[PDB]
Design a protein around this motif. Sequence first.
Motif, PDB file in Angstrom:
ATOM      1  N   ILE A 131      21.889  20.919  -6.492  1.00 17.57           N
ATOM      2  CA  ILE A 131      22.706  19.991  -7.267  1.00 17.57           C
ATOM      3  C   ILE A 131      22.592  18.580  -6.702  1.00 17.57           C
ATOM      4  O   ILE A 131      22.539  17.599  -7.453  1.00 17.57           O
ATOM      5  N   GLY A 132      22.541  18.453  -5.374  1.00 15.31           N
ATOM      6  CA  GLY A 132      22.361  17.140  -4.777  1.00 15.31           C
ATOM      7  C   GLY A 132      21.024  16.516  -5.131  1.00 15.31           C
ATOM      8  O   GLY A 132      20.944  15.322  -5.429  1.00 15.31           O
ATOM      9  N   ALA A 133      19.956  17.319  -5.109  1.00 16.28           N
ATOM     10  CA  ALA A 133      18.643  16.816  -5.495  1.00 16.28           C
ATOM     11  C   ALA A 133      18.618  16.413  -6.964  1.00 16.28           C
ATOM     12  O   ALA A 133      18.035  15.383  -7.323  1.00 16.28           O
ATOM     13  N   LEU A 134      19.246  17.216  -7.828  1.00 19.05           N
ATOM     14  CA  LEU A 134      19.329  16.864  -9.241  1.00 19.05           C
ATOM     15  C   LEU A 134      20.073  15.550  -9.437  1.00 19.05           C
ATOM     16  O   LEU A 134      19.638  14.692 -10.214  1.00 19.05           O
ATOM     17  N   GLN A 135      21.193  15.372  -8.732  1.00 18.79           N
ATOM     18  CA  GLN A 135      21.962  14.140  -8.857  1.00 18.79           C
ATOM     19  C   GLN A 135      21.167  12.939  -8.360  1.00 18.79           C
ATOM     20  O   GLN A 135      21.179  11.875  -8.989  1.00 18.79           O
ATOM     21  N   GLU A 136      20.462  13.092  -7.235  1.00 15.36           N
ATOM     22  CA  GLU A 136      19.663  11.990  -6.710  1.00 15.36           C
ATOM     23  C   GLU A 136      18.538  11.616  -7.668  1.00 15.36           C
ATOM     24  O   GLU A 136      18.292  10.429  -7.917  1.00 15.36           O
ATOM     25  N   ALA A 137      17.846  12.617  -8.219  1.00 11.87           N
ATOM     26  CA  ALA A 137      16.765  12.338  -9.158  1.00 11.87           C
ATOM     27  C   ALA A 137      17.292  11.673 -10.424  1.00 11.87           C
ATOM     28  O   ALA A 137      16.683  10.723 -10.934  1.00 11.87           O
ATOM     29  N   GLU A 175       0.823  -1.206   0.000  1.00 13.74           N
ATOM     30  CA  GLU A 175       0.000   0.000   0.000  1.00 13.74           C
ATOM     31  C   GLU A 175       0.859   1.258   0.000  1.00 13.74           C
ATOM     32  O   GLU A 175       0.528   2.242  -0.673  1.00 13.74           O
ATOM     33  N   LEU A 176       1.968   1.247   0.743  1.00 12.47           N
ATOM     34  CA  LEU A 176       2.859   2.403   0.753  1.00 12.47           C
ATOM     35  C   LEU A 176       3.550   2.590  -0.591  1.00 12.47           C
ATOM     36  O   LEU A 176       3.800   3.728  -1.004  1.00 12.47           O
ATOM     37  N   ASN A 177       3.867   1.493  -1.285  1.00 13.30           N
ATOM     38  CA  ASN A 177       4.458   1.610  -2.613  1.00 13.30           C
ATOM     39  C   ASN A 177       3.436   2.073  -3.641  1.00 13.30           C
ATOM     40  O   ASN A 177       3.788   2.787  -4.587  1.00 13.30           O
ATOM     41  N   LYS A 178       2.171   1.677  -3.478  1.00  8.95           N
ATOM     42  CA  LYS A 178       1.131   2.140  -4.392  1.00  8.95           C
ATOM     43  C   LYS A 178       0.823   3.616  -4.173  1.00  8.95           C
ATOM     44  O   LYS A 178       0.585   4.356  -5.134  1.00  8.95           O
ATOM     45  N   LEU A 179       0.828   4.063  -2.914  1.00 13.11           N
ATOM     46  CA  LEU A 179       0.585   5.474  -2.632  1.00 13.11           C
ATOM     47  C   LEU A 179       1.759   6.336  -3.077  1.00 13.11           C
ATOM     48  O   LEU A 179       1.565   7.443  -3.592  1.00 13.11           O
ATOM     49  N   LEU A 180       2.984   5.846  -2.889  1.00 11.68           N
ATOM     50  CA  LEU A 180       4.173   6.588  -3.288  1.00 11.68           C
ATOM     51  C   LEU A 180       4.847   5.926  -4.482  1.00 11.68           C
ATOM     52  O   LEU A 180       6.038   5.598  -4.429  1.00 11.68           O
ATOM     53  N   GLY A 181       4.094   5.725  -5.565  1.00 13.31           N
ATOM     54  CA  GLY A 181       4.671   5.101  -6.745  1.00 13.31           C
ATOM     55  C   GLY A 181       5.619   6.025  -7.486  1.00 13.31           C
ATOM     56  O   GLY A 181       6.756   5.656  -7.792  1.00 13.31           O
ATOM     57  N   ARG A 182       5.162   7.244  -7.785  1.00 18.19           N
ATOM     58  CA  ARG A 182       5.974   8.241  -8.472  1.00 18.19           C
ATOM     59  C   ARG A 182       6.777   9.107  -7.508  1.00 18.19           C
ATOM     60  O   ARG A 182       7.066  10.271  -7.818  1.00 18.19           O
ATOM     61  N   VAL A 183       7.144   8.572  -6.347  1.00 15.98           N
ATOM     62  CA  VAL A 183       7.884   9.303  -5.327  1.00 15.98           C
ATOM     63  C   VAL A 183       9.302   8.751  -5.273  1.00 15.98           C
ATOM     64  O   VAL A 183       9.498   7.533  -5.182  1.00 15.98           O
ATOM     65  N   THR A 184      10.285   9.645  -5.334  1.00 18.93           N
ATOM     66  CA  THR A 184      11.693   9.281  -5.271  1.00 18.93           C
ATOM     67  C   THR A 184      12.257   9.694  -3.918  1.00 18.93           C
ATOM     68  O   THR A 184      12.122  10.853  -3.512  1.00 18.93           O
ATOM     69  N   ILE A 185      12.881   8.747  -3.224  1.00 23.88           N
ATOM     70  CA  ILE A 185      13.490   8.993  -1.923  1.00 23.88           C
ATOM     71  C   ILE A 185      14.988   9.177  -2.127  1.00 23.88           C
ATOM     72  O   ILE A 185      15.654   8.314  -2.711  1.00 23.88           O
ATOM     73  N   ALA A 186      15.517  10.299  -1.647  1.00 27.72           N
ATOM     74  CA  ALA A 186      16.937  10.581  -1.805  1.00 27.72           C
ATOM     75  C   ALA A 186      17.760   9.740  -0.838  1.00 27.72           C
ATOM     76  O   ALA A 186      17.397   9.573   0.330  1.00 27.72           O
ATOM     77  N   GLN A 187      18.876   9.205  -1.340  1.00 25.05           N
ATOM     78  CA  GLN A 187      19.794   8.377  -0.555  1.00 25.05           C
ATOM     79  C   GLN A 187      19.091   7.162   0.045  1.00 25.05           C
ATOM     80  O   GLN A 187      19.432   6.712   1.141  1.00 25.05           O
ATOM     81  N   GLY A 188      18.107   6.622  -0.670  1.00 21.86           N
ATOM     82  CA  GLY A 188      17.368   5.472  -0.187  1.00 21.86           C
ATOM     83  C   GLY A 188      17.739   4.183  -0.889  1.00 21.86           C
ATOM     84  O   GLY A 188      17.592   3.094  -0.325  1.00 21.86           O
ATOM     85  N   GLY A 189      18.221   4.293  -2.125  1.00 19.64           N
ATOM     86  CA  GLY A 189      18.601   3.112  -2.875  1.00 19.64           C
ATOM     87  C   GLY A 189      17.395   2.382  -3.445  1.00 19.64           C
ATOM     88  O   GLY A 189      16.338   2.966  -3.691  1.00 19.64           O
ATOM     89  N   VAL A 190      17.568   1.080  -3.658  1.00 22.79           N
ATOM     90  CA  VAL A 190      16.531   0.211  -4.195  1.00 22.79           C
ATOM     91  C   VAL A 190      16.527  -1.089  -3.397  1.00 22.79           C
ATOM     92  O   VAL A 190      17.290  -1.261  -2.442  1.00 22.79           O
ATOM     93  N   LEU A 191      15.652  -2.010  -3.795  1.00 22.10           N
ATOM     94  CA  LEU A 191      15.556  -3.299  -3.123  1.00 22.10           C
ATOM     95  C   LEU A 191      16.568  -4.281  -3.707  1.00 22.10           C
ATOM     96  O   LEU A 191      16.783  -4.301  -4.923  1.00 22.10           O
TER      97      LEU A 191
END
Lengths: 80, 90, 88, 101, 101, 99
Positions: free
Chosen positions: F54-60, E75-91
């Motif tokens: 710049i950090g936000a641009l790089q992360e995106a 549900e959290l992935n469906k709500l935040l589908g087009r949301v990018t988390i900085a310094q979060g990485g991937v699965l």
Amino acid sequence: RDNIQGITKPAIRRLARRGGVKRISGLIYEETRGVLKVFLENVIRDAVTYTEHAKRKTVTAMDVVYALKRQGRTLYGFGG
Amino acid sequence: KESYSIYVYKVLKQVHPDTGISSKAMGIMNSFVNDIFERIAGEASRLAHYNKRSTITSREIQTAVRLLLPGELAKHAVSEGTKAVTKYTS
Amino acid sequence: SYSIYVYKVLKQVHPDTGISSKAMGIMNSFVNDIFERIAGEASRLAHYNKRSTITSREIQTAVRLLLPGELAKHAVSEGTKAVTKYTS
Amino acid sequence: SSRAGLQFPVGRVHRLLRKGNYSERVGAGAPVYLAAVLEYLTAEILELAGNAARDNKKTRIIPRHLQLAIRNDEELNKLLGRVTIAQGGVLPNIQAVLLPK
Amino acid sequence: SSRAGLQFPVGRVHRLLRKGNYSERVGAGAPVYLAAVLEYLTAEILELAGNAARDNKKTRIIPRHLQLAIRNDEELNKLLGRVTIAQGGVLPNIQAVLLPK
Amino acid sequence: KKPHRYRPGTVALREIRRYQKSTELLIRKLPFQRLVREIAQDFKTDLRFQSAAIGALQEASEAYLVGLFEDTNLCAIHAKRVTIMPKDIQLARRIRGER
DNA sequence: TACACCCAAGACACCAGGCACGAGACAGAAAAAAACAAAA
DNA sequence: TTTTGTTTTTTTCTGTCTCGTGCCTGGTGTCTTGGGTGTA
DNA sequence: TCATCCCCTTGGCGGTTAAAACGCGGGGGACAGCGCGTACGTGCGTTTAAGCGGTGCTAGAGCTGTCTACGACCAATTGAGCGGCCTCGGCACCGGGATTCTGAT
């Protein structure tokens, strides 16, 4: 000048390994650099538009956040 | 129920004096005009809220058009808007 | 900002767990995005019904439209409980 | 409308911007600019639709003509990418792999 | 906030809704409802992040913990589908065809 | 004695696991900053940029590239192939709606 | 941040073509035969 | 070498197109005053 | 009060820092071909539920009056977050010990 070559082959290789890519070809790096340049231009155009609408000469993080939200790439952690 | 069917018909007669328009095409044009209106109004409201401004002028609409419309369409729309503003002010 | 409130919520749900500055900024951005989305949905619902006043029903409809399934149900229940506790 | 040389209404656009819950105050040039942009877009779309109808031997505009006029233009298709046109169909595009020989 | 039993501010939410140019009038239950929904969402996200941090022997919530908490929940992935988390990485997801046969 | 040599496929998966476990920025800071400044110079000359922007641009950009690489790997595996090809990137960008 | 300045919001009073209701008609899908290049 | 898709040429009614036309609703002058920019 | 030497400090010409493009050993499989394989393409026969046209039943929003109370705006009151100041510790980096797939036998 020619700063698109800054994204060297190891950077693209690491970005592919993060996405789960095992084998990379030779013509992949050029297409990746082109797509990255296209995306960066599309974001920076809206960022510069937002900055010029505020009569400012410094592109802040809020302008980048708004440009990414108006496109479809919502980014968090840059609103403070 | 208000609609821009009269103005769409006038624009069609201006660009094509001998060409009609169906009811479904008229509804599609009305929906397109409403969508463009809503998009530009929302973009202008966002631009005004980002600058702590409570007034929406021609600059906000021009910025919204430049951000939404792509390239030549945005340039032509900006030129037409500036010409209309100059003609209305004079 | 929503720093102290997020910290209090974290202490309520996890008494022995901290939070960094980047995580706090991410949480604040998420809260602001949810706020903006729900406010826009409520404004749209009020404009569609020729209404000039946003009440708890508009927020409930916005939550039901945005949040999916169990999240929406739990958020609606929490909002209804908070409204009934504030009105009493 | 008559002073700005536009067929679209300016007072109606101003009233919709005032009661549309967008800002506390609306300027005097913003409705004129928005009406001019809408008029330019409508004129371009209607000219393309009339050309498509003349290419189809018809004195009327049908949703198929609007679809053939919007999907053919690059910028118009980019602007209305996430837009579904009812009774408009799709472009008659067939891949070269499915063609014989 | 004290009368509704919520940690999120009610007056601040009311002021933001009044100054955001969303409607002419704002009721007294809408800010309470919105604050309660925001508090519940924040509580769920923070609980999932704390669980992910405890699973990694960490006492401080990092963006990686938030990413692991959002992506693992459906549900959290469906709500935040087009949301990018900085310094979060991937699965850490690896396809089965890429494993050594 | 012949020195140790890993077969093609081991170090690739090792790097995959290492870069999927860590969330550090894979693109360098100075070249990306220079590229961003050069791109912004084409739109408006004499432009200043903050570190957060710049950090936000790089992360995106990194997140978008990771998603595109995931889609490319999916398209390559779908075509009964392991090595990624520009055709997979084109198909991914066409299905996503960018082209 | 300050002084100036001028057309719009509001309101009164006056005035003109849209729009739907009919009608004669207007370019065209169809009904059908007949005919040429390319495909199988 | 013979069968089948594709293109051209008659009317004929056929869903639709602009004309004829009445009510009024939204299409124009004129007083006031003043707050959002213009320029500094 | 309105000319030489010469010590050396300001200009431009020389040095190390952290990883990958050639240069080479090389091999797993994409491409093209061989060869097996069976679900339905197209045509026929047969049956039916959607289409068109009515035909009869029934309710609930559009719209119009009536009554109403929390919403907006005004003077006093007041309370903890921000900025700032002072305290405190979790884990990235070091280095070694223990663990581990992988190729060669």
